[PDB]
């Protein structure tokens, strides 16, 4: 029950380490709304962009280095991090590229926010084809005063689809005395 909520931009340029190139308040509202009261695995690089501990969430920074703060939970491996969350019904992965790439293979949902603004980001979200990701929720907004460019929301769930078969028949062959 892992999630990889992100704010993917054109050509999946997450730009997490570098300060958010758009700063859309709505994108943060979506984040907050879908990440409140649940643990939020992140990365040390991402933890240096926010600084303060997110309120109401069990912040779990996955930093190889030792822990530097005592207001957030500190883990140093991917297998322990998932366990460190506990038995919560849904986990949210908000870390950067490295974090996303490590948790995506074990992710069930994707709270994506597709921003239209084009930036030359250095970090990118992993590649996810659409045949295996069956969308569930989608919302389309438009650029406003606070939101420089338009922003679209989306939720997906990994679900498989079966395919029919050839439906071949069984012909018969008759044999006579001669």
């Amino acid at each position: 029950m892992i999630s990889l909520i992100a704010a993917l931009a054109v050509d999946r340029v997450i730009g997490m380490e570098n300060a958010m190139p758009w700063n859309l308040p709505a994108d943060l509202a979506w984040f907050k709304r879908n990440t409140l009261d649940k643990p939020v695995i992140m990365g040390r690089h991402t933890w240096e962009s926010i600084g303060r501990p997110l309120p109401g969430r069990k912040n779990i920074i996955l930093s190889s280095q030792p822990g530097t703060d005592d207001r957030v939970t500190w883990v140093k491996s991917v297998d322990e991090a998932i366990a460190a969350c506990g038995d919560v019904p849904e986990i949210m992965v908000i870390g950067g590229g490295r974090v996303y790439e490590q948790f995506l293979p074990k992710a069930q949902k994707l709270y994506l926010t597709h921003i239209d603004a084009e930036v030359e980001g250095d970090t990118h979200f992993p590649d996810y084809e659409p045949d295996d990701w069956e969308s569930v929720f989608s919302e389309f907004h438009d650029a406003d005063a606070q939101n420089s460019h338009s922003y679209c929301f989306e939720i997906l769930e990994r679900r498989g689809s079966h395919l029919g078969l050839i439906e071949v028949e069984k012909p018969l062959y008759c044999v006579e005395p001669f």
């Binding site: 709304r33 879908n34 969308s135 569930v136 929720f137 989608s138 919302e139 389309f140 939720i155 689809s161 079966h162 395919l163 029919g164 078969l165 439906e167």
Partner: protein, 111 residues
């Protein structure tokens, strides 16, 4: 349209279309009309034995039995503005008039 659990479409998207026309007004969509064209192509190949699931034929008929009569469909909350994050909209199909249509080529011989 195809049976549930297969790559093809589903019988619930029909309500999505009806919703879009109604402007996502469940009350309006619940009192709408539908026209399912080509209802003669989902016919069961009765001459074949029941050895495979006709996901395109009999499979689609078995799925509309409760839709055309009445059920509570679960449609994805998709649209311009959707208040329910993941609370799939419940639409009652007990007041939606369905008007099927087909050419039924070959029925003349049967009669």
């Amino acid at each position: 349209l195809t049976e549930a659990g297969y790559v093809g479409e589903d019988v619930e998207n029909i309500i999505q279309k009806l919703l879009q026309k109604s402007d996502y007004d469940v009350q309006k969509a619940q009192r709408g009309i539908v026209y399912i064209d080509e209802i003669d192509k989902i016919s069961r190949k009765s001459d074949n034995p029941s050895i495979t699931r006709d996901v395109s034929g009999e499979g689609v008929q078995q799925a509309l039995l409760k839709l055309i009569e009445g059920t509570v469909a679960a449609v994805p909350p998709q649209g311009g503005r959707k208040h329910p994050q993941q609370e799939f909209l419940q639409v009652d199909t007990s007041k939606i008039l369905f008007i099927c249509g087909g050419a039924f080529a070959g029925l003349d011989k049967v009669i």
